[PDB]
């Protein structure tokens, strides 16, 4: 009985540790986009045919990079010591999640320019010594939102099997179900019209 609760509390620390570690790797990956790909492009220059199109490719990813590197990662680390702050962390910053929905809506245009200039961006990748393509990096913010949902769901189960007050955690989960859906809606609307 109380041995089942102890396993459940363990499960819940595990999920938090996975949330923080994948957050560190998420920040590193965004850093490769911003401090690697985008920095290399300023050094390398863009062919005249592409003038300004790099802004469409990267969109608002810097806004996402800064928010996780400078705020969200540290707030998640603080949750390892103060567990109940986790649900409120997602709830209280719901409006900030529009940066992701904004990212999703611009995604079809970005995908087009990345493919249209594939040889150029393949050069950039080589010139920064990365194994993954630019496209494999630019998907990561979209994937990250589904990762938060899956992890908050595991956090929810463990916290239920520990007999804990789950009310604010259910709201956190519901929120991170609605964001991927809105993301997919925006992307699908952006498929209706191109250049």
The CATH number linked to 169 is 1.20.900.10
Give yes or no for a contact between 137 and 29, defined as CB atoms under 8 angstroms apart: yes
Q: What is the resolution of this structure in A?
A: 1.9
How many folded domains does the chain comprise? Answer: 1
Residue 166 lies in a domain: yes
User: Cβ neighbours of residue 74 under 8 Å, at least 6 residues apart?
Assistant: none
Residue 85 lies in a domain: yes
- Which DSSP string corresponds to the chain? -HHHHHHHHHHHHHHHHHHHHHHHHHHHHHHIIIIIIIHHHHHH---GGGTTHHHHHHTTHHHHHHHIIIIIHHHHHHHHHSTTHHHHHHHHTGGGGHHHHHHHHTHHHHHHHHHHTHHHHHHHHHHTT-SS-HHHHHTHHHHHHHHHHHHHHHHHHHHHHTT---HHHHHHHHHHHHHHHHHHHHHHHHTT---
CA distance 76 to 151: 13
Residue 151 lies in a domain: yes
Domain of 184 in residue numbering reads as 2-190
CA distance 194 to 102: 17
Residue from 131, 107, 119, 127 nearest 57 by CA: 107
Residue 135 lies in a domain: yes
Residue 195 lies in a domain: no
Residue 142 lies in a domain: yes
């Amino acid at each position: 009985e109380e041995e089942q609760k102890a396993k459940a509390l363990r499960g819940r620390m595990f999920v938090l540790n996975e949330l923080v570690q994948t957050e560190k790797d998420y920040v590193k990956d965004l850093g490769i986009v911003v401090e690697g790909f985008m920095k290399r492009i300023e050094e390398k220059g863009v062919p005249e045919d592409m003038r300004g199109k790099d802004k469409i490719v990267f969109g608002n990813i810097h806004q996402i990079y800064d928010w996780h590197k400078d705020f969200f990662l540290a707030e998640l680390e603080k949750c390892i010591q103060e567990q109940d702050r986790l649900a409120q962390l997602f709830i209280k910053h719901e409006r900030k999640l529009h940066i992701y929905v904004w990212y999703c809506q611009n995604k079809p245009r970005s995908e087009y320019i990345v493919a249209e200039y594939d040889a150029y961006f393949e050069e950039v990748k080589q010139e920064i010594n990365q194994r993954l393509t630019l496209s494999d990096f630019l998907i990561k913010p979209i994937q990250r939102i589904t990762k938060y949902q899956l992890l908050l769901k595991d956090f929810l189960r463990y916290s239920e099997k520990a007999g804990l007050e789950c009310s604010d955690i259910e709201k956190a989960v519901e929120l991170m179900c609605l964001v991927p859906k809105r993301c997919n809606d925006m992307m699908n609307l952006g498929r209706l019209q191109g250049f």
